[PDB]
Amino acid sequence: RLQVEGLSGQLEKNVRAQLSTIESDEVTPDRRFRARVDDAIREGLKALGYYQPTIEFDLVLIAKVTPGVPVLIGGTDVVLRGGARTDKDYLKLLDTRPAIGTVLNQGDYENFKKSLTSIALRKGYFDSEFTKAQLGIALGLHKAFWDIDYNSGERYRFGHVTFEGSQIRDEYLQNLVPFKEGDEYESKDLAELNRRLSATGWFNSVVVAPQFDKARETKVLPLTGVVSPRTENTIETGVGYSTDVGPRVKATWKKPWMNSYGHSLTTSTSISAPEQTLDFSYKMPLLKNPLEQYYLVQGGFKRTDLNDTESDSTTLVASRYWDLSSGWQRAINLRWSLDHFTQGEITNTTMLFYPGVMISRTRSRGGLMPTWGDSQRYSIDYSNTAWGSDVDFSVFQAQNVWIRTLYDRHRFVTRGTLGWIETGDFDKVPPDLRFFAGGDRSIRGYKYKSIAPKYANGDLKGASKLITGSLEYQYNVTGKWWGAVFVDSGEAVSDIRRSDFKTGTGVGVRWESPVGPIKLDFAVPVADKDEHGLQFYIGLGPEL
Ligand SMILES: CCCCCCCCCCCCCC(=O)OC[C@H](COP(=O)([O-])OCC[N+](C)(C)C)OC(=O)CCCCCCCCCCCCC
Ligand SMILES: CCCCCCCCCCCCCC(=O)OC[C@H](COP(=O)([O-])OCC[N+](C)(C)C)OC(=O)CCCCCCCCCCCCC
Ligand SMILES: [Cl-]
Ligand SMILES: [Cl-]
Ligand SMILES: [Cl-]
């Protein structure tokens, strides 16, 4: 074992980090090893300014180190040529230089050099060169002097972008170029072009390559965006199980490009004992803004046989979307639907036609089980008999998911859902538009959609208002395995002045499996004389 002495602050920290690279307690020499320790100490001290120390050993081994005289900064001379002499980023860097008199750190010199080189790369100074770069160390004066003469040249500007291998018409790609021809080069614009192209889903691969062979004389940099068409068909499946609903299967078939206009088609189905759906979604990007703006035409079929609800539904939807890179989506919707249903003893055929608006956003960082993220969705729908709809109503909805991680190991998932349907003919409203609570992602511990007001005969009727929330805490026990504890609470009522909150609580497991996060929850109803017994759930739940 070895020990130091004679170092006060950071000096005793850097030396300790330098010594913990060679093995201490070991069968080793006593005049060849203490020569290895000596070289290390002097190197850690040299980096912090002390060039002329003194070290000496006794016996466990101890080493009396003395810092000695430090070399100070005598001059940080730097001259800049080209656009750098007047460039704000280069000017800003010149202040980072260490003041005269301060103790020398060799890291500051080489890092200043890295920064000169880094800014040139970022801002397109592709003719940048050091004409001089030297650090003079004068031990006689105990002074160090920079001497850098750096010539950046002039900024390169963007040329034309030529695309290769695209199955999509070129005009769509040109309208995704975030810069104008002639704009001053900026590295993040290339990154943004790559991002935008990839985000369309049109391509298997995207590589934007600058053509330096040409831009040497003109200082105008043409780009070549070579792409490969996306796989024409993709099929994802998914399976889940819950004690109340039973097994559940989802499958989606994506055709991320249907033609050279960049249209895409998604066919989806969700199958369980009580509910079955089949949906189609056809997307048509607008030429002016192919990524941010598009039309959606959706058509769907649904069948429900659940509790006191029997229903079959058909719907068509036309939507106009405005998406932002910030994550916000904004849409105007126009929905038509036909619903044949029986709720309790009430049977009806209802045709609806109504517009609506939707605002949403989803953010995520950390992968499939994100460490941080959130999702928000707010919508308003308005049906009116004046334009052919069978029922007058207004539906307001809001939902939130918030995910945050503390100290790498403590993950908090918070959810909240609000729903309000205002109408004077509730009996004609299809069950799908009414509110029921209970079940996973509603109130765990209660049966799927079992919570709602009832007809006089005891049959479920559905609610005109919905309020639910959940607090969940997860702890990363080991590796990819987490323990979870949660409480869910909410109500589905038709008179908000008359509360009837139901609360469920439970514990669970989470596993970051190769195919994504797998959850397992056990849950019971809390303080309910009418409801007892454990519900459990297993699946690939998304959280957000
Ligand atoms: C709820 C959904 C409602 C359906 C909405 C559909 C709306 C469709 C309107 C637009 C049609 C496409 C316009 C178009 O561009 O047409 C031509 C296009 C080919 O053009 P191209 O220049 O690539 O030539 C080929 C490439 N080459 C020249 C290099 C060889 O052909 C195609 O897109 C043919 C494929 C289009 C099929 C769409 C199927 C929709 C129905 C799904 C089922 C829903 C049931 C409820
Ligand atoms: C590659 C795509 C894979 C899709 C998924 C594969 C099939 C998964 C079946 C899972 C069934 C287990 C759950 C179950 O028990 O569910 C029962 C359900 C209806 O049973 P039920 O009416 O006798 O009584 C229903 C009412 N009660 C039970 C209260 C009396 O079963 C059904 O709906 C069966 C629906 C079968 C659909 C056949 C495939 C069409 C896919 C087209 C679109 C694909 C786009 C990607
Ligand atoms: Cl268009
Ligand atoms: Cl809608
Ligand atoms: Cl009814």
Curated annotation (Swiss-Prot):
Regulation: TAM-mediated outer membrane protein folding is significantly inhibited by darobactin, which acts as a competitive inhibitor of beta signal binding.
Keyword terms of this UniProt record: Cell outer membrane, Membrane, Protein transport, Signal, Translocation, Transmembrane, Transmembrane beta strand, Transport
Region (POTRA3): 138-217
Record InterPro entries: Bac_surfAg_D15 (IPR000184), BamA/TamA_POTRA (IPR010827), D15-like (IPR039910), POTRA (IPR034746), TamA_POTRA_Dom_1 (IPR035243)
Topology Periplasmic: residue spans: 1-231, 256-263, 285-293, 324-327, 363-372, 405-410, 476-480, 513-515
Protein location: Cell outer membrane
Region ranges (Sufficient for outer membrane targeting): 211-544
GO BP term, example: protein localization to outer membrane
Main subcellular location: membrane
Self-association state and partner proteins as the record states: Interacts with TamB to form the translocation and assembly module (TAM).
Domain remarks: Contains 3 N-terminal periplasmic polypeptide transport-associated (POTRA) domains and a C-terminal 16-stranded beta-barrel transmembrane region. The 3 POTRA domains seem to form a rigid body (unlike BamA where the 5 POTRA domains are able to move independently). Upon substrate binding (Ag43, AC P39180) the 3 POTRA domains move away from the inner surface of the outer membrane by about 30 Angstroms, which would deform either the outer membrane or TamB and may provide force to reset TAM. POTRA1 is required for interaction with TamB. Possesses a dynamic lateral gate, which may provide a different environment for substrate engagement when compared to BamA, explaining how TAM may be more effective than the BAM complex in the folding of certain substrate proteins.
Protein name: Translocation and assembly module subunit TamA
